[PDB]
Amino acid sequence: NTTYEALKGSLAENSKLPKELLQNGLKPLLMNLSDHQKLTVPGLDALSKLLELLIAYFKVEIGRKLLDHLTAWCRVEVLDTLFGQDLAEQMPTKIIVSIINIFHLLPPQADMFLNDLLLKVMLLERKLRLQLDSPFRTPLARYLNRFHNPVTEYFKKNMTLRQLVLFMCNIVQRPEAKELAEDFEKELDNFYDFYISNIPKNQVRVVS
């Protein structure tokens, strides 16, 4: 935290001349991010604190390796070790929370890792069979309120799913999603017209 304060106070007088130590400063962390499968929590913390810049990761392929490591940390054999104990002092839970957390500071490109990340977190919640507040809903709320323009259309394109509605109604109430809440308050009538027009097409899931 102290060196992050030093960087954010010292990079106001930025220059182009740093071009060699960037291939040596953030290089061991990005090499740690590779196919190693053993990531640390303060390593991902320092990766986020370095990821608050806009240089040297202009290629958005860090997200593909992050989703590969996330899928390799939400396996079945490692979640079998999670069986029997709690869900806040375990190391894979902290690692998955940090991996989801450093999706918040990704470059603002066309986020094709929205649907994959949302389905993976909802499948991870369904696989740990918890239907209430979960450890990795706060970093996902910090991910969702940042962009928050395509997630409203992704929500409006999927309203027949009960679990997505419960997930979003739990996300919006969090104080880390203050701008996703006002994005939903101006779209209640669209939800009204959707549900009213889609009741008589089915008439078998009307209580949902």
From Swiss-Prot:
UniProt family annotation: Belongs to the PI3/PI4-kinase family. TRA1 subfamily.
Localization terms from the record: Nucleus
Protein name, entry field: SAGA complex/NuA4 acetyltransferase complex subunit TRA1
Subunit structure: Component of the 1.8 MDa SAGA (Spt-Ada-Gcn5 acetyltransferase) complex, which is composed of 19 subunits TRA1, SPT7, TAF5, NGG1/ADA3, SGF73, SPT20/ADA5, SPT8, TAF12, TAF6, HFI1/ADA1, UBP8, GCN5, ADA2, SPT3, SGF29, TAF10, TAF9, SGF11 and SUS1.
Additional note from the record: Although strongly related to the PI3/PI4-kinase family, it lacks the typical motifs that constitute the catalytic site of PI3/PI4-kinase proteins, suggesting that it may lack such activity.
Its job: Essential scaffold subunit of the transcription coactivator SAGA complex. SAGA acts as a general cofactor required for essentially all RNA polymerase II transcription. At the promoters, SAGA is required for transcription pre-initiation complex (PIC) recruitment. It influences RNA polymerase II transcriptional activity through different activities such as TBP interaction (via core/TAF module) and promoter selectivity, interaction with transcription activators (via Tra1/SPT module), and chromatin modification through histone acetylation (via HAT module) and deubiquitination (via DUB module).
Annotated source species: Saccharomyces cerevisiae (strain ATCC 204508 / S288c)
HEAT repeat ranges per the UniProt record: 20-56
Comment on protein domains: The C-terminal domain (2233-2836) is essential for its ability to interact with activators.
